[PDB]
Amino acid sequence: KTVVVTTILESPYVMMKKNHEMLEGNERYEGYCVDLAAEIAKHCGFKYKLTIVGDGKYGARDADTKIWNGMVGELVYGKADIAIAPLTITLVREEVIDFSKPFMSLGISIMIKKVSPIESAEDLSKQTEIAYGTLDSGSTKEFFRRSKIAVFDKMWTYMRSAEPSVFVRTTAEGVARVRKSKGKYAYLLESTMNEYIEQRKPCDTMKVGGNLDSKGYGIATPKGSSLGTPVNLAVLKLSEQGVLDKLKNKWWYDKGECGA
């Protein structure tokens, strides 16, 4: 029996191969999530088929509709069996889907173009000269929306009352907006994506401040499924054996094309 693996097109997690138009099947994708999925399948023993989620959204609940979109929606409704992707572990997701022990740690970073008049998030919040945005239907936007600290609440109040819309459709759009806004635009993305972007050509962006909090990426599976404990133990073995560290090193610092 096949196993549908709903993923996202995120780099270096899943990529299009350099000659992917001559390849059909699982061979046409490469990345950290593909290698992770291969090791999960090898440890468990199931034949898997990588599929891309239909809408490039990780997943959230709509405004007064109670419908899950994206990969989480792909999982709740049974169209998907497992989600090996940069899926952030949260409360709202845990109430409807079950994660694994996180396989990669991360936080909320800040990305700007290359004196550093921003400093940490406090000085970022004090000044309205510089603009900043997040990814719609993500964990960072919902982190700010539900935040009860003063600084984060003021940040969220700014973000919702911004014209034109400051939220970006994809992280590629957000990075392009950081690059093309001559230092006026800032990005609140997950620190792992920030590092990968800051290590690649043309390498004109850099990360300031520490991460605002700390989270993890989990491997999702429908509630009550029989794939929960096996993938949990798979993640634990992969972390204890250094495989997860090795894959992050291969896909994050092995190439490392910039001067530093």
Ligand X SMILES: NS(=O)(=O)c1cc2c(cc1Cl)N[C@H]([C@H]1C[C@H]3C=C[C@@H]1C3)NS2(=O)=O
Binding mask 195-214 for its own copies (x = CB under 8 A): ------------------xx
Peptide bond into 12 cis (omega under 30): yes
Min. distance of Cβ 240 from ligand X in angstroms? 7
Closest to its own copies by CB, 53 or 97: 97
Question: Cβ closer to its own copies: 146 or 180?
Answer: 146
Applying CB under 8 A, among 56, 209, 210, 216 the residue interacting with its own copies is 216
The item of ligand X, its own copies, ligand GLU, none sharing an interface with residue 26, based on CB under 5 to 8 Å by kind, is none
CB atoms under 10 Å from CB of 212, counted, come to 21
Specify the DSSP element, H or E, that contains 44. Answer: helix 32-44
Report the residue number, 178 or 231, with the smaller CB distance to ligand X.
231
Among its own copies, ligand X, ligand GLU, none, the one that 138 touches (CB under a kind-dependent 5 to 8 A) is: ligand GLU
Give the interface with ligand GLU as residue ranges (CB under 6 A).
Answer: 58-59, 86-88, 135, 138-140, 171, 189-190, 193
Break-preceding residues in the chain (C–N over 2.5 Å): 114
214 is in an annotated binding site: no
**Cβ neighbours around 211 below 10 Å, total:** 16
The Cα–Cα gap between 194 and 141 comes to: 16
Contact flags string 134-153 toward its own copies, x per CB under 8 A: ---------x--xxxx--x-
CA–CA separation, 81 vs 238, rounded Å? 21
How far CA 60 is from CA of 66, 99, 107, in Å, comes to 9, 15, 19
